[PDB]
Amino acid sequence: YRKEYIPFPDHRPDQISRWYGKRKVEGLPYKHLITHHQEPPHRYLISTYDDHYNRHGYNPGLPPLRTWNGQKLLWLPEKSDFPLLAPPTNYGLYEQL
Amino acid sequence: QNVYGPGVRIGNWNEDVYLEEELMKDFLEKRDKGKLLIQRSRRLKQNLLRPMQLSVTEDGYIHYGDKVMLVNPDDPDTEADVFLRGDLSLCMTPDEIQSHLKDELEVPCGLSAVQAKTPIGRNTFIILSVHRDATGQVLRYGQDFCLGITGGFDNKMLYLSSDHRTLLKSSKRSWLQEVYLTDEVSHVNCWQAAFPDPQLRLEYEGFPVPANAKILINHCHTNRGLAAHRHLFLSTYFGKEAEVVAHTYLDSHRVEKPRNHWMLVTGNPRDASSSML
Amino acid sequence: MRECISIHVGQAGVQIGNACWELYCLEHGIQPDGQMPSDSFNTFFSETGAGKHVPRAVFVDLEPTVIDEVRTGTYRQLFHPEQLITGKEDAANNYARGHYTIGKEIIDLVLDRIRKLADQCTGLQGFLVFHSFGGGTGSGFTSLLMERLSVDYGKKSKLEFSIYPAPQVSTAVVEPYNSILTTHTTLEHSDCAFMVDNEAIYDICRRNLDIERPTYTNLNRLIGQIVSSITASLRFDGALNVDLTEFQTNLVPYPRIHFPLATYAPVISAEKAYHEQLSVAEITNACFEPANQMVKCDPRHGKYMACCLLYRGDVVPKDVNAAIATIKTKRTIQFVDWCPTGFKVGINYQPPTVVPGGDLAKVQRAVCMLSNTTAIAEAWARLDHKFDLMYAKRAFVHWYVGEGMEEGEFSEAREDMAALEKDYEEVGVDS
Amino acid sequence: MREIVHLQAGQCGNQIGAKFWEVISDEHGIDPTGTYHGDSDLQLERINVYYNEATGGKYVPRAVLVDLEPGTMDSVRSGPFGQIFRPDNFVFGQSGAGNNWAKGHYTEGAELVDSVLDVVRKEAESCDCLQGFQLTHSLGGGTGSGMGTLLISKIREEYPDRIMNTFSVVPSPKVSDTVVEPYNATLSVHQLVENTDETYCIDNEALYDICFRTLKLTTPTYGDLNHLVSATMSGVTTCLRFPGQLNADLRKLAVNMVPFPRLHFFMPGFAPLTSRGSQQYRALTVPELTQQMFDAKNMMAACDPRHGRYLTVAAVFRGRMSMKEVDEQMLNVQNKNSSYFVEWIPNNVKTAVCDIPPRGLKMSATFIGNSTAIQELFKRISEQFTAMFRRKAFLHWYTGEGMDEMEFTEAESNMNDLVSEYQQYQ
Amino acid sequence: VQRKQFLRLLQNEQFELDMEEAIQKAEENKRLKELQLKQEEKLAMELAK
C-alpha cells in the first residue's frame, strides 16, 4: 500500500475532450445543412400583394416587351419566374413600435 | 471496415472535402470582416488593461483631481478558513456574458476587489469635488468628495453610486446593499472620509487627509461604509475576485472592523508606473 | 445533488475501495491532502467552508490491520476519522461468528454513521456495497447490514459488488459454507448483484495486458474502472444518461433474477494501443467474446436474457446502432424468445482516465457491458456440488453450531439454492 | 393574434424544443439576447403568436418546458438559445422516471402535474384568442410517455373546444435503445387515440436514412436530426405567421385530413433536401419539389406507402410562386398513381400556399400524409408487446405501482381494434 | 448554469484560437522547407563550380 499509493501531484484531469464531444454531437448549423445557393437573408422577404399592387410590377431589369427565345421555345422574358429582390416591404410599424 | 480521414481518397471523401472547404471559407470570411470573438475579446482586454501613471503628492495630503488607487489593506482575520490574502484593489467589473456578446460596456457596472498591485486601466480613480473648479485644494475629513473612473476609456466618465435596499435590487452574492458605477450626476455619488478610531473622529474631522493612510469611506445618503468581503468569491473573466458591498461592521467594542478600512494610494516619484507598495 | 452512498465491508471491500476512491480523486482532480489544486464532484465529496472535500462512504471491517494502513497511508488526511469503522477481532472465515456474535457490537456504530450520512444527503440515489463471499466479515456482517437497511430504508436501490469464489483456485477451505448462507440475505434484500472472481481477472491480465504476475493492487484498479464507468453517467454530462434506477430496472425481469455479469473493453497496454486502432465495433465485440468474460462461465451454453451498455468518450450514436445490428445477426449469440429488443444504451462524453504508473493505457473510448444471462446456473451447480460433497461427511459443522445458530440453516439454505436453480431453468426455457 | 401554446416533455422533447425555438427566432430575426434584429417588417405583424411582449422590447416564448430529470434542464438553459426561455417556464422534479410508464403516470408524475397546471393555465388565459395546443415528446421514455399523456388527459377535459397536435417519437424498428420500450409505448398509444386531434409519427432511424442518402453526411448526429424535424414543425404553421395566396392553419389542415375520429395518425415530410455537392447544380423548381416530396426516401416514418394506400394528402407550399404548375403536377401524381390512392374519396389532395419562404431558401414545401400503411408500425410493436407479455416478464415494475393486470389487456385490445379499423377502410 | 454558459463561451474562444494556430503552422512549414531547398541547391552550384 505504501509503495504503490503515492500522491501523484502532477496529474490534472482533462477538461477539453468533453467540450469537443459536446460540439461534435451538437453538429452542423443551418447554413451548412439547409441553406441553399449562399443567399443572404435580406432579399427574399417580399409579398405578392406588395409586389403586384404597391410596386405596380416595377422591375427595371426586365424589358417591357417579350422576345421569342429561339433555342428554347416560347418567350424568354417572363415575369413569374423572374421576381423582384428589392429591399423588403417596409412602413411605419417598426418605427411606431 | 476502417476509416482514414481528410486527405485520403477512400469512401465518401468528396462531400467531406466540400464541407471542409465551405467551413474554412466561412471562417476566413468572418475573420476577414472582423467578427471574430477572440478579436473582440482582445480589443476589450487591451482597452481595459492599459497602463497609466498616478499622481505624486509633495506634502502628503490628498489633492483634488489626483489619480489615486483604492486598496483594502491585508489583516490576519480569523472569521473564515479561506479568503483573499494580501492587499486588494477596488476594480470595476462588467458582466461577463454581456461583455462577450456585446462590445460596448453597459451601465451600471459591478465592482470587485482584485489582487492587483500595479496601476492598471481598471482601478485608478480620480477625486473630484461636487462644487467643481477646485484647483490645488486639499481633501478634508468629513467633507464631501466624489470618485470618477475612466476605466481605460477616453470617451466617458463614470462615478461610484449606491442606494437604499429594495426587494428588487441587492448585491450579487451577499444580499446586502450594493455599489455600482453610473454616469448620472446626483447626490448618491457623494462619499465622506472618516477617521477609524471613534474617540478622535470628531476631533480630526475637518483636517486634510493623509496619503497612504487607513480611513473609512462612507456613503452620504445611506451612511454605509464601503466594505470588502474576502470570504465570498466572485467568478469573473479576470479570475476570482473579492466582493464589495456597502455596510458598517462593528465588533464587540463598537470599533470598525478591518473590512471597512480603505487606503488611497498615490504614485512613486522615482517610478510613476509603480505605487508606494 | 444526486449522490450515492458506498459501503465497503470486508478486507476485499476496503482494498477495492482504496483503488476506487483513488481513481475518483484522480478523475475529479482531488489531491491526497483533501482539496482541489490552487459541481460534478458533489455526488461523492462534500463542500466544507474551508474548501476541503470529504467522501460520503464508509469502510467497515472487524480487524484493524487493514484499516490502519489507510490511517497511516498517503490518503490519511482525505478520509474522515469516523468513516472507517474498525472492530476488535476478525470473524475468521466463519458465518455465525460474524453474524450472531461479532456483528452485533459494531452494527449500531455503522448505523449511526450512515444515518449521519443520510442526514447530509439531500437526494439519495442508493447504496453501492462492496464485499467478498469468501470472507468472514463480508459474509456474516453483510447479512445483518442488508437485513437492517431493508427495515431502515424501504425502497432505496441496492447495488451489490461481490467477490465470487473462483471455480478452481481459491484461498479458503470453508468458502462453500460462507457462500451458501449469504444467498438468503442477497436474494430478497438486494436489488442488483454484480459478480466478479479473481481467476478470470488473472486470465484477462495474462493475455491482454502482457503482464505475467499481477496482484490485488492491479486487480482492484480494473474493478474501480468498472465502477467509474458505471457511475460516470451520474457524474458527467452525456448524450444519453443512465441513472441508478435505470439499469437496475432494465436488467431484471423477475425478483429472483438479479445476477448479471460485468465485462469491460478495451483492456490493452500502452505499447499495443498506439498500433491497434480502436473502433466502436471492435470494442463492442470484444466484450461479447467469451475469453473476455470476467466471471468464469461460458455464455454459449446459456442464453442472453438482457444487456446494458455504458459507453465513455468520443462515441457517436451511429456505429453503436450499426454494431448492434451487426451483433444481432450472429447465430453464435443466442437470445431468449420473450426479449427481442434486449439492449439498453447509455453514453457519457468524458473519456476514461488513467493512473500514472498503471498498466492500462490512455484511451479515447471504452464500453462496459452488464449482461444478465442464464449461464450462472452452471456456476451455482458447481458451487453447491462442492457444498454437497463437503457436507456429505459433516465437516466443519461444529464451528457453526457452537457459535449459536441452528444446524437446520444448512439444509434450508441448500433447499433454497436448489429452488433458485430450478427457477433459473424455468426462466431459461422458451415458450 | 391566434396564439398557440407550445408544450414539451422528456429528454427528447427538451432537445427538440430548444431546436424548435432556434429556427423560429431565426425566422423572426430574434437575437439570442431577446430583442429583434431584422431587415423586413412582415416579421412583426404576426409575432404575438409565439412571442409574448415584455419590458425591454423582450419577446419570450409561450412554451412550457417540463422534465422529471433535472439534468436536461441545464443543457437547454446552457444552450446557444438558453437565455430567451423564461426561468419560470421550467418545471422539474428531483427523481427521474427511468423508462417506466407506471412511475411517470401514476406515482412520480402525479404530484408534478398539479404544479404545471398552474403554469399552463397562466399562459393560456393570457391570450385573447387561443388557437390551440402543440406537444412534442417521446413514447420510449418514462417522462415523455408517462407524464406527457397525463397532461393530454388533463388539458382535454379542461379545454374541450380546442385543437391539440402531437409530435410523438415512435420506437424505432431496427435498433431499440430501451428493453422495456414496448411497454412504455403501447400504454401511451391507448391514451393517445381518443384524446388527440392530430398525431405525427417521427422515428430516428428514418431520420438517419434521410441524412445518409439524401443529405450525404458522415456524422449527422442527434442535433442534425433535430434540424430536419424542426423545419417540419415551423413549416406546418406557416400561414398563421405569414400572409400568402391561400391560407391554411392547423384546424384547416385537420378538417381536410381526418375523415373519422379514429384516423388521425399522420406521417410528415420535408421537400427541399439536397446534398452539399449537388447544392448548386439543381434548379429549385416546382416539379423538382413535388418529385422529391412523394418519394419514400424523403418520408419521416418507418412505413413504406407502397405497401399501403394513401387516404388523404396535404401540401403546404412557401415562397413567391405560381399556381398552374402547382395544380398541374399535383393532379398528375393523382392521375398516374391511381392504384396508390383510394377511390371512395375524390380529390384526395389539399393545397396551401404562403408568400414568405424559410431563410436562406427560395421555396419550400411540407408534406402531411394520412395513410393505411401506418398500421404496420403498430403491428411491429404489438407483436413485440405480445411476445414479451406471454412470459409475464418485466411486469413487477408495473404492478408494483398500483396498476392492475387488466390495463395491459385493454391496451392491446384497443390497439388491435385500431389496426382492424385501419384495415377495413383500406 | 451561469458557470456552464461561461465555460461554453470560453470553449468557443479556444476553438477560434485553435483554428488560427492551425492556419499558421502550414505556412511556417512551407517557408522553412522552401528556404532549405534553395540553400541546398545554391551550395551545390557553388561547390560544383
Ligand SMILES: Nc1nc2c(ncn2[C@@H]2O[C@H](COP(=O)(O)OP(=O)(O)OP(=O)(O)O)[C@@H](O)[C@H]2O)c(=O)[nH]1
Ligand atoms: N479481487 C480482490 N479480491 C480480494 C482482495 N482482497 C481480498 N480479496 C478476497 O477476499 C477473500 C478472503 O476473504 P476476506 O474478504 O479477506 O476476509 P474478511 O472479509 O476480512 O473476513 P475475515 O477473514 O473473517 O476477517 C479472498 O479469497 C479474495 O478473493 C482484493 O484486493 N481484490
Ligand SMILES: Nc1nc2c(ncn2[C@@H]2O[C@H](COP(=O)(O)OP(=O)(O)O)[C@@H](O)[C@H]2O)c(=O)[nH]1
Ligand atoms: N430525434 C431525436 N431523438 C432523440 C433526441 N434525444 C433523445 N432522443 C431519443 O429519445 C430516446 C430516449 O428517450 P427518453 O430520454 O428515455 O425519454 P424521457 O424519459 O421522457 O426523457 C432515445 O431512444 C433517443 O433515440 C434528439 O435530440 N432527437
Ligand SMILES: [Mg+2]
Ligand atoms: Mg477481516
